[PDB]
Amino acid sequence: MDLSKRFNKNLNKIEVSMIRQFDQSISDIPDVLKLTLGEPDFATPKHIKEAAKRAIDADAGLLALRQAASAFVKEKYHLTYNPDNEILVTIGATEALSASLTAILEPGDKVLLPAPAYPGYEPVVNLVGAEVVEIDTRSNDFVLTPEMLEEAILKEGEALKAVILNYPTNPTGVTYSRQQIKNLAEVLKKYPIFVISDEVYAELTYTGESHVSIAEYLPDQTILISGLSKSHAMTGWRLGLIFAPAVLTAQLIKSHQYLVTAATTSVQFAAIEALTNGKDDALPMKEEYIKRRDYIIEKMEAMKFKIIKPDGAFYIFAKIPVAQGQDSFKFLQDFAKEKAVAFIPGVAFGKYGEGYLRISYAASMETIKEAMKRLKEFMEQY
Amino acid sequence: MDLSKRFNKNLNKIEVSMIRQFDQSISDIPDVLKLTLGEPDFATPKHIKEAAKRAIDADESHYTGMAGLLALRQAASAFVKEKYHLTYNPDNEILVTIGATEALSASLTAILEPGDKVLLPAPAYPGYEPVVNLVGAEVVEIDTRSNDFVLTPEMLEEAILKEGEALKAVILNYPTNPTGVTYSRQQIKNLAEVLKKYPIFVISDEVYAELTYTGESHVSIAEYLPDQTILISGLSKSHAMTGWRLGLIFAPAVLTAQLIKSHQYLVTAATTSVQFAAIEALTNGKDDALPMKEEYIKRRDYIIEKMEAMKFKIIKPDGAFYIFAKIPVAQGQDSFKFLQDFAKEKAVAFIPGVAFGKYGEGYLRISYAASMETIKEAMKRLKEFMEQYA
């Protein structure tokens, strides 16, 4: 306990993860059905497994990856990033946040974030010495308005360094239309701030019009974080991608510890394959997912849960009716105890998620039907 | 639209690697024989590749914890007990990481603060400083030239006292990149006797441990300082698991709790197929390093022979796989340019001594992680190129 008080002070801002806590609290319950995952459990295709094994027994320098990534976001999202100087690679999603947030942040700084939100941004922000200010989006059913945004920016004043936008959104499944994105950009272009655009769920958009990135309309302020593992099998190498104008990336690149500058074919190949040969594997997956989502929505509506229209995968965010209930953590622990199925408590996504549970439909239809069956059983009690 | 002045300020202190600059400078020369590799040239042993492939075929998603599969931690615990006589509880004292460098970096950022100083013995391996700078702390390099780049207890202490209470940590790297230097049990003990009276972290970078050539095996300072050492290892040097990302952190439970609190949210868990490979390596490949070590000793001896025939002063290489050698001609005082010229005239690349801290000038680093064919060829061309001098 001598050196243990000589670490970085910001670790004293780091609380225990709400999700990890919830899982360890229900770990000793045998055969829990899990609808809690943020990464789907893909059945890796035979050809990909064989490719991976060949790359093991191989024993180029990120160029082909960067190029494929560039072509990909041009075709998909009409964005132009030069593979030579505007595209960075990370070994995993969380390193992308580490790299970019450590590059931009300074101790006084505030970071705005629509809430409820993925629990992983605030820790990183805290570690580098800054603060997250949530934006309560409850009044528009979790859809951030340009007005909400501008009022929050104005509230935070001169210490505002960045806004983090996550769309399609975890945990709510919120997506934004072209005009919405355009209006948000119209707010953001008036302030000297970075925009962290976390678009990892982009491929899973159910709207009919496809995903629109804020970088289409706000290219100079946007650091675009993307990836592939939400919709492609990666054999565990869930590489992240950072896209940003040359002038910004020339700075971002100096967060060296958090960036990939060389990798074996074993490491890159699943990402390269997903960007090129698997570039359209999300379409059928979307068909199936729309089915799963519709089924859950119908069955939970029948139980009189209030459901946020999930236009982007793969979460349903449900308002637990009964007063049980204002303690979603407990409500879900009791569901876990009596019915042996797990969701994640809305509280795990901060204050503004209480009274909600998050169901992750990146799971088989059978696990889904069983889960709803049991929930229906669990609710007769109420 | 101008956000140039809106970044973290510490980014100011971070330039490109002098190594990278030298490689860039010679990128137009074709068919260059490179002896610059920072990783073993050997393929990963079959039994390990095999375990990887079985894991790929099993296709278990199998999210493991922040600390890695328990079987992996148990294997690492057992490994360092048997090999280095160290006792770490796999339940709470071992962290599994996507590579030794990320284990090290993550450890630095968890312990550092803007005020802080970190001490590092000459000649500095350039990978450390950027991490520290990114946090806003600073690296202070200890001039060890007067002992041929072997750190002495006196240098250490003098350095420690010179820095204030601003001193947060010492980084020891043994066997050392770029010198090949090692420390005996007694030397390690003497350094520990110095280090134990200061409230500071000891970052002990022991990735090269298995590549020790002295007939006494590697001794870790963690053996003498169990409570203040954070031990960084991995399987890249010992098991030729290169571009596999398996790093290991060993630390007292109290330190480990903090470390993992910080790592949870900054880095990604190791790939589980890799973690299975690592279990195979650590449990069934305990002596995988030996054949490689034999090959390395032969290459090393050939190089020492040839290089001493041309009057290079060679720092004693006891740990792999670098030879740091002093240039015996005037032009050698610009090692950068001397090696540029060597490259233009003979198409072979070494790394200039200047790329390793500020006390490295007049030296060159050969990496003998390289085939004997091209090592022999490199030495013959080097002879030819040295003819030109008197």
PDB file of N, CA, C and O in Angstrom, chain B residues 1 4 51 59 73 162 173 179 190 275 285 317 343-344 347 355:
ATOM      1  N   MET B   1     -12.222  25.629 -38.131  1.00  0.00           N
ATOM      2  CA  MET B   1     -11.661  24.577 -38.958  1.00  0.00           C
ATOM      3  C   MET B   1     -10.206  24.344 -38.605  1.00  0.00           C
ATOM      4  O   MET B   1      -9.666  23.285 -38.908  1.00  0.00           O
ATOM      5  N   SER B   4      -5.406  22.720 -35.128  1.00  0.00           N
ATOM      6  CA  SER B   4      -3.987  22.453 -34.865  1.00  0.00           C
ATOM      7  C   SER B   4      -3.557  22.780 -33.430  1.00  0.00           C
ATOM      8  O   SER B   4      -2.620  22.183 -32.897  1.00  0.00           O
ATOM      9  N   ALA B  51      -1.638 -25.631 -32.210  1.00  0.00           N
ATOM     10  CA  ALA B  51      -2.656 -25.232 -31.223  1.00  0.00           C
ATOM     11  C   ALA B  51      -3.491 -24.037 -31.705  1.00  0.00           C
ATOM     12  O   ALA B  51      -4.724 -23.998 -31.510  1.00  0.00           O
ATOM     13  N   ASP B  59     -13.480 -22.479 -33.070  1.00  0.00           N
ATOM     14  CA  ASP B  59     -14.312 -21.306 -33.347  1.00  0.00           C
ATOM     15  C   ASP B  59     -15.171 -20.889 -32.151  1.00  0.00           C
ATOM     16  O   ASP B  59     -16.302 -20.452 -32.326  1.00  0.00           O
ATOM     17  N   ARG B  73      -2.851 -17.890 -17.421  1.00  0.00           N
ATOM     18  CA  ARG B  73      -2.209 -17.323 -16.240  1.00  0.00           C
ATOM     19  C   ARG B  73      -1.553 -18.395 -15.372  1.00  0.00           C
ATOM     20  O   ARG B  73      -0.480 -18.183 -14.821  1.00  0.00           O
ATOM     21  N   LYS B 162      19.681  12.652  -8.224  1.00  0.00           N
ATOM     22  CA  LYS B 162      19.608  13.848  -9.064  1.00  0.00           C
ATOM     23  C   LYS B 162      18.172  14.239  -9.453  1.00  0.00           C
ATOM     24  O   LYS B 162      17.822  15.420  -9.438  1.00  0.00           O
ATOM     25  N   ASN B 173      16.070  -2.963 -18.802  1.00  0.00           N
ATOM     26  CA  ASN B 173      15.825  -3.828 -19.945  1.00  0.00           C
ATOM     27  C   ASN B 173      17.010  -4.770 -20.134  1.00  0.00           C
ATOM     28  O   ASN B 173      18.050  -4.387 -20.651  1.00  0.00           O
ATOM     29  N   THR B 179      22.327  -3.623 -26.920  1.00  0.00           N
ATOM     30  CA  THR B 179      23.717  -3.998 -26.641  1.00  0.00           C
ATOM     31  C   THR B 179      23.955  -5.496 -26.478  1.00  0.00           C
ATOM     32  O   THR B 179      25.056  -5.988 -26.728  1.00  0.00           O
ATOM     33  N   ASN B 190      22.850  -6.048  -6.499  1.00  0.00           N
ATOM     34  CA  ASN B 190      23.409  -4.742  -6.151  1.00  0.00           C
ATOM     35  C   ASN B 190      22.522  -3.573  -6.615  1.00  0.00           C
ATOM     36  O   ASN B 190      22.283  -2.594  -5.866  1.00  0.00           O
ATOM     37  N   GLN B 275      -4.277 -16.915 -27.037  1.00  0.00           N
ATOM     38  CA  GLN B 275      -4.183 -17.372 -25.668  1.00  0.00           C
ATOM     39  C   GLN B 275      -4.073 -18.905 -25.589  1.00  0.00           C
ATOM     40  O   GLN B 275      -3.298 -19.430 -24.785  1.00  0.00           O
ATOM     41  N   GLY B 285       6.089 -26.199 -24.504  1.00  0.00           N
ATOM     42  CA  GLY B 285       7.215 -25.668 -25.258  1.00  0.00           C
ATOM     43  C   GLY B 285       8.195 -24.938 -24.365  1.00  0.00           C
ATOM     44  O   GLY B 285       8.818 -23.962 -24.778  1.00  0.00           O
ATOM     45  N   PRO B 317      28.351  -9.256 -26.038  1.00  0.00           N
ATOM     46  CA  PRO B 317      26.983  -9.709 -26.296  1.00  0.00           C
ATOM     47  C   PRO B 317      26.676 -11.020 -25.560  1.00  0.00           C
ATOM     48  O   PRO B 317      27.054 -12.083 -26.045  1.00  0.00           O
ATOM     49  N   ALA B 343      25.403   1.365 -46.905  1.00  0.00           N
ATOM     50  CA  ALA B 343      24.223   0.932 -47.648  1.00  0.00           C
ATOM     51  C   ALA B 343      24.281   1.284 -49.146  1.00  0.00           C
ATOM     52  O   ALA B 343      23.939   0.450 -49.987  1.00  0.00           O
ATOM     53  N   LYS B 344      24.722   2.497 -49.479  1.00  0.00           N
ATOM     54  CA  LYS B 344      24.834   2.897 -50.886  1.00  0.00           C
ATOM     55  C   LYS B 344      25.845   2.028 -51.611  1.00  0.00           C
ATOM     56  O   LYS B 344      25.626   1.617 -52.749  1.00  0.00           O
ATOM     57  N   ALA B 347      24.813  -2.255 -50.301  1.00  0.00           N
ATOM     58  CA  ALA B 347      23.428  -2.720 -50.166  1.00  0.00           C
ATOM     59  C   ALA B 347      23.174  -3.562 -48.902  1.00  0.00           C
ATOM     60  O   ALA B 347      22.502  -4.598 -48.950  1.00  0.00           O
ATOM     61  N   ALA B 355      20.458   6.104 -33.168  1.00  0.00           N
ATOM     62  CA  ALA B 355      19.036   5.830 -33.036  1.00  0.00           C
ATOM     63  C   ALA B 355      18.658   5.341 -31.623  1.00  0.00           C
ATOM     64  O   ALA B 355      17.479   5.136 -31.326  1.00  0.00           O
TER      65      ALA B 355
END
